[PDB]
Amino acid sequence: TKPVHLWTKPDVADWLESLNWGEHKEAFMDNEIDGSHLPNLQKEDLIDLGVTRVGHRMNIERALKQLLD
Amino acid sequence: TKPVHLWTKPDVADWLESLNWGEHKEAFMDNEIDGSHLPNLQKEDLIDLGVTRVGHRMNIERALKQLLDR
Amino acid sequence: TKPVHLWTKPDVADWLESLNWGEHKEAFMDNEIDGSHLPNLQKEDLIDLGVTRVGHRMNIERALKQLLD
Amino acid sequence: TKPVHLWTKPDVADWLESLNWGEHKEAFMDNEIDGSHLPNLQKEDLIDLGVTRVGHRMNIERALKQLL
């Protein structure tokens, strides 16, 4: 399995789609988010990426932290 | 009773109604608040969820801390 | 290569181009960024310089570390 | 969205791949094609870039104008 730190920008878009978060793939792509960034995103980054719903963002944050395992 | 961390989004709405805070049901549901979020909500989160009255917000903050010992 | 602390303002523009970041030349030049400033550039500075896209900004922060560290 | 006129040479390569036209990334990269050029390429430019199959080139020309 490809490790997260090597995921490309399309790999990140595929990850979002796998979790039914494709609504954010355009913003993540336009902001050039790849796997070297993904597990290190903070609350303010996700707001800048258009993730605004409180519980929704906390869910994404949780999933992001899990990628560190 | 169900532990807080397993509360669904409807379960959280039920909790708000139990404490006569049903005015915030819609915002909590639209923001997908479930029990895995409740004890970690901070002032700014509550403001984003429409809890703007000062003393009212403080009362909710107290009830959230209480979830840690229920 | 010329040491970074000696880089002129055009030297910083060349570096931006060398990494396909020429879209930021005008802002860096207008703000008078030279080599003596590159080790002091923080996130807020880069945002002031027009680097707003999230992953793109973290890519520039990474390259600055690679250039100087 | 990043405007086309600011696409870098890698951005153009990624665009080619995205449309399964990756066979031409090397030529576009070697010829320093970026977003400032992409929407202005003509038939003869595309031929110089290795895009020789007729219908295939016509499809790229169609996409290049939809970038606008």
Added chain:
Amino acid sequence: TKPVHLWTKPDVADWLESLNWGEHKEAFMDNEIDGSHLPNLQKEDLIDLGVTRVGHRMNIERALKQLL
């Protein structure tokens, strides 16, 4: 993994070991430190818990700020 606010006292012990700070397990255990307390510990709490070396304490404070 498990959210920090749910961590039991043994869970906090496991976290300390995971960062090679096992010298502080029994003190954290005896003081009944669990996840509900962990992120809110201050300098004087850590000193009360036996975390005395300056840099070593700053390192623990940094990790605490990260689990939160």
Added chain:
Amino acid sequence: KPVHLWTKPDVADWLESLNWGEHKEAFMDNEIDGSHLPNLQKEDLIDLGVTRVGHRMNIERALKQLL
């Protein structure tokens, strides 16, 4: 199957079996089959997209055992 008869899909299955599926596409794209697998050197693996150092040495180790 013996290794030197492995098809391109056979090599892909091998990578999958070792949870190295991230290299399926490049190995398939580069037309790697059993007749090539044993003769792959460090620079061939790099050309095939194998950049993690220790991981690459793990693959090289398995390629020898494949013999």
